[PDB]
Amino acid sequence: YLTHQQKVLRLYKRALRHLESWCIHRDKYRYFACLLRARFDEHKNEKDMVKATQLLREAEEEFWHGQHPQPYIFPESPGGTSYERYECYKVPEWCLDDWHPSEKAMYPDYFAKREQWKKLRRESWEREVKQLQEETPVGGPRTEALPPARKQGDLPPLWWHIVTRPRERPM
Amino acid sequence: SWDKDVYPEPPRRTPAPSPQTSLPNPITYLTKAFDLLVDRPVTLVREFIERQHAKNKYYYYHREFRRVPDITECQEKDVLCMFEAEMQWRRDYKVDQEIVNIIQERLKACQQREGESHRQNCAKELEQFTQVVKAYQDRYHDLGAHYSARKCLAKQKQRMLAERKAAKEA
Amino acid sequence: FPKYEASRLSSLPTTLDPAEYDISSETRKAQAERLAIRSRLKREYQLQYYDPSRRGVIEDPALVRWTYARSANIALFGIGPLVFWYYVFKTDRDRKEKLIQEGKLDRTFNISY
Amino acid sequence: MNMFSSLSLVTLLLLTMPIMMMSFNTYKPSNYPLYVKTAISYAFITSMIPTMMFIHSGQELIISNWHWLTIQTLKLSLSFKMDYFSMMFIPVALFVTWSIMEFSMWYMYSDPNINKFFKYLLLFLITMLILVTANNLFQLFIGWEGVGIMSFLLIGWWYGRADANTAALQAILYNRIGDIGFILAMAWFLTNLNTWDLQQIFMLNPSDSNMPLIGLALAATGKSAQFGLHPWLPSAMEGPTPVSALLHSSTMVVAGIFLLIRFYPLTENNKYIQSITLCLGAITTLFTAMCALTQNDIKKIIAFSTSSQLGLMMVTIGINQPYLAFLHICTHAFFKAMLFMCSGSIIHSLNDEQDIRKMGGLFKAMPFTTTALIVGSLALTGMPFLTGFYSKDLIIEAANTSYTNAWALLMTLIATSFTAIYSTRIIFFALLGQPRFPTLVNINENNPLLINSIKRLLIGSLFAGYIISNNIPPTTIPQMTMPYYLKTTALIVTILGFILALEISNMTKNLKYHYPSNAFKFSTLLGYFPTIMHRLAPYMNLSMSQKSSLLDLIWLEAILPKTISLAQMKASTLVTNQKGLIKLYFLSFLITILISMILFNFHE
Amino acid sequence: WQEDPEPEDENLYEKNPDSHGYDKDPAVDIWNMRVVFFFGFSIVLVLGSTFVAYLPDYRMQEWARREAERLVKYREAHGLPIMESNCFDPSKIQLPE
Amino acid sequence: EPYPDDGTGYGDYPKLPDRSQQERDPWYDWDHPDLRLNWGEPMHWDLDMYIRNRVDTSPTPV
Amino acid sequence: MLKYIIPTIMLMPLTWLSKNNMIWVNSTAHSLLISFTSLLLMNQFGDNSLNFSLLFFSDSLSTPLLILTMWLLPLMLMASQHHLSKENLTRKKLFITMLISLQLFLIMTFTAMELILFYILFEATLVPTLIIITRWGNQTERLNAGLYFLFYTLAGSLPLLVALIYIQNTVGSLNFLMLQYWVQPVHNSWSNVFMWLACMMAFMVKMPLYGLHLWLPKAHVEAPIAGSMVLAAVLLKLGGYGMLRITLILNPMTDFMAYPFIMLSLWGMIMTSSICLRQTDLKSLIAYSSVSHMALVIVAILIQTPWSYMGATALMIAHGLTSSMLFCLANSNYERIHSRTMILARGLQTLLPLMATWWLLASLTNLALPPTINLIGELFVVMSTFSWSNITIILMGVNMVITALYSLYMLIMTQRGKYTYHINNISPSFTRENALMSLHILPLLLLTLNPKIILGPLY
């Protein structure tokens, strides 16, 4: 699934981040990040892909030996301290349909504009289905990529749940 | 309030205040504030309620159960006599549970009252607790959930038989 | 670098998997066929998930198949453990009953049971 | 008596009033958190009057105000014990909770469910005061399980996060394992002494107390997170920072130690239990202090500090010094709660960043948090005459001069040295050096709720130990004669730990890259206890049920629904599959009559 | 074959946003809410709890305590044992052998 | 690949790799992000044991 | 007891003569009035039971079961009326009639003095229960669940019929008051071993005893909600109540005959609790939770001590309200998503906040949080089995750990985490559903303030 170039670049990013977790201090990190870059540049032009694969394989074993047992993780990345912290506050938009009319009356302007989005979704749906139908090979899609809208006044197929997803800090 | 003989207390011995400082005791002034702001209004409310109770005075009594023949005097399978004997035994069983509770409450109050000297000063309560527990255990312990006067008697006669045999060998 | 020893609860990292780098062309073909199945199912799901008029649950046959299989078919389960505990408790209670009969178990304040 | 008893109860009743108002809709939601914070502060005031009365004359009493239930010869009353331990602990818990609640008004200001959060904090406190004032084991059990369940709800506050839910259930798992010991002690005391009341337990003073006390030691091991049942306390850092401050200082974790202090009249006569708690505390204090040496999350460092300090309290129990163990509980509550509040200040100012490797250069940018962090670190490390010194210093001397396990004593001194190291590690990486946080600088500690909350705990962290030390009545013969090298051991090894910590920290600046040692990986991954035990044990249990013996095959195959049903189905086809021929039916009549006379003599 | 299609599920809130969930008829829906709340909460739970609280000495627990006090007072005053091992008078018993 | 025929009762249910859901890519756009599952894909027999709240089989540095 | 039997019977003409749209209003209102009057049975004395007549009697054991029985009928009516909305009127009335007739048999079962009268009414409860499951259950398997339920019970009850008739011939009576006075010890012999088994196995299948339990998860998965409520709240307790009474005449043989059933229950409770951790069907999980809880009841009844009989009575009442509440909570989700799979709909606290509080309270009672009557009953059983043998504390302790694990796991999986994206018909909780939940939990938690009324005759 990953190409050789993709695997090399992912190792390079991964090794730098673990190197950064060992060094801590910026001047120390900058110094050793340059040595590491030099090692990658030492074989950038290796044309023999059999040798190149072995270099990649050996670099991965070297990384496994020298990885930080407790590397730095950005707080909201998977495994971070703030990961998924705000999922409890994310409420799907369809819940507003079940509001009592008295609750809806407190935001007359918000719910007026909400009807314009629901109307837009209703009048776009048939085109989106028919566009996907006529752009999909006989044996169904071969990838998960979706197409853009082709005409003016058309919306890209399957847009609602991307466009109206909850905000990252919804409360 | 309660019978002082059933629930005895010793005579309290408080020491008189003997200050050795010029600073005022904050507890003494808080006590005056508590008496004025808390106890006094509370007492007035109670005294009002006590006046109303006096206007309407009525009584309730403690039920007295006549003694009836016990299970030892009941002919085998004579349910009418066994019933009265069995209901009486159950009433006494509930009374003995409360007698042990009274003695346990004496022991617990003594331990708290005597402070760090409780091991020496609570000997009599401890000894009385030990005896009533022994007597209660002999009467009722190991009878099972379906206990009855009949099973209580069977247990006593077993104990009496072991006591007679032990003396016989002595 | 001592080699990685995988276990049941500690699996081999992908970057250390020798099969990860020795991609043939029939392995590429298998990967392309797996993605086709995933994409075909993704489309089927999305055409219902995005439908404005749908209100309910998108029934998933995979989930129904899993629960159906897991609920079928109605040593820790036979007579072994029952026998083992029987001899543990019977032995303990025989010893206790013997002591009580000989008057050698302390029950001085035991009047609750 | 009337003022003392009346004010002891208003304190507890006062705390339940905000709960009443919420659950009956008769309060102002605009500032429920302020209302809850005000109730705590008034409860602290009223609780200081009974405490003053006790300090004056040693006035103690028990209130058995409500007869709840009588089981034959076991009478259960709602019974409150206003004694030495209740009188001293309640004001400390209320004073600290007062700071934590004022701090939470700033820290949780953006939480949509702040009102529920403050209700949970108040319930979490009430269950602790039930635990502390309980006079019988059933009532104590109510508070025991109450703090556990409140911990579950507050650790799993952000319930959309799987790790938060996992940590919340982990706390329940480890604490219910300890609860096996609590129920064991309850069962033993009922069967052998006919009571759950502390008065009768102490009066009967059983000599054969191994079984009940091992049960209590197991309960304390879980609630205080001693070795074997320890991992849940570091994992509890999933909860919001105010939860960690309260969980780690004034409520849950010290309950295990407090349970053993309650029962010192039994443990002081049992050398065997003393030895067990001594060694259990010694391995706990060393092992968790070793783990803190390599942690990078600021909250986990302070979490391991609590475990290490709890182990020291368990060592104090083990050397027959219950009142010194209780003093450390009271002093530790101040600076430990303030260290968590200092860490929350830094985390907030750095956009929820908790890794110390991304801190640095905060000594001047956060002057007040810096001051509180330094004071708290010095108090924790036993700097002379700060609040931590008036307990730890006496504890190390008591252990040095006792008839004691030699290995446990050595492990305790090394852990004291390690305390200086991870305390240095926080200060060095959080406050010193150059900044390592992102470029957009939103550092701001200038909220009055933040400054005032920390300020009160800072004043407590300087003077509380001195004030408490000089007011409590003596209950032991403190040991004051010893060689110079046993008198100053704590101060020396603490100083050595600081000097060594500097060397190690400053070597992180040299342009040398090191491979990890095996000792470093052991410390970083917490001895592999969570990695091995939290995978293996769940795997065994979870595959236990969702899962061959021939003996069982006989009985199962015999009396299955499928086997019985097949038999009748087979018998039915034998009975019913007939040719319909007159000839065969009558021929069977002939056989029937013959065997009736020949085999069975029915003709006779 | 000749089978009716499966009907779509009905949301009671669509026709009646004030629905209590009891019935699709608004007037019946409200009445059914009131009987449940009045007979359930106002009567059974509130009056039933009050009834239970004032039961006259459930299983003579209080009488037994008063009776025990009377016996303890009498037996200590007269120097008798508080309680005896034998429940039944041995003079009324006749052992075998 | 089915489980080996025996008396357990798997039937023809697929035998899938004995891997935790914690090992799946967290950045991919799963239909069930918390479980890291896609609609329609076969669920491991022991999935309820391999959810992210329970048994982890992730590679370890040691 | 006629002051309860007759008004219960009158609920039938009331339902049939009601206006078309007032069948739910009328039957619910009047069955609550009957429930209210059931508190007059609290006139319990310390020595004598309340003996009304030659036929019926109440004591501290049957009284709490009677009040639970009569309180459950109105709750079953609120629980059922939504999923029966499309049923034709006559079939709705027949459904209500089956519930009314079940209450009539139950209140007579718990008050019968004579044991054959108990047997007949104990057996009569089968008919309406079977009809409710097989007629108004949802899926195909309800026909098999009816057959397993019927024949498990009859395989045990028919030997009981022989044993009871045998006992009357020998003793001369089966009146329970007489048996209290005419009871004679059971001597060792093979005849008495089978008399003991014939007297007990019918009640063991009802509890159900571990190893004889597999019918229960089938019945619950297939039954409608009212069927589950009565099954879990009261019908299982017929076995417990029967055993509590009939053990009077099986002494001392119970001393050793209990061992195989104590081992099954002590081990069975750990296995069923662990099974709950891996269940995928929410109704099946709650059914296994019931087997685990009832295992303690069997142990408590078999060891025959005052503390265990008090623990058994309290657990029976506490389990009835808790398990019935859990089924109602599970059903309210089912009426939205039409599936019992526990993993299907997650993160529901985000969408139904108050209903998530009912889940929390129900789970806390299931894991027996002090001072709930669930804990009081469990604690009393744990105390008494410790005296029976100290080692049992380990099995009891492990079960309490596992019980907390699956109780919270059920709460965490359904209420926490991220909501399922594609499920978008999670409408707000109805007043009926919230009232239904609170009519379980409120009486349950109020009983904490006055536990004695559920501790049975040994109190």
Ligand SMILES: CCCCCCCCCCCCO[C@@H]1O[C@H](CO)[C@@H](O[C@H]2O[C@H](CO)[C@@H](O)[C@H](O)[C@H]2O)[C@H](O)[C@H]1O
């Ligand atoms: C302790 C005493 C217990 C007494 C129990 C009461 C007796 C009940 C008698 C039922 C006997 C007949 O029950 C019958 O069993 C077979 C099982 O093979 C079922 O038959 C079913 O299973 C078999 C294989 O298992 C298939 O080949 C068959 O196609 C299928 O219909 C019948 O659908 C069922 O009606």
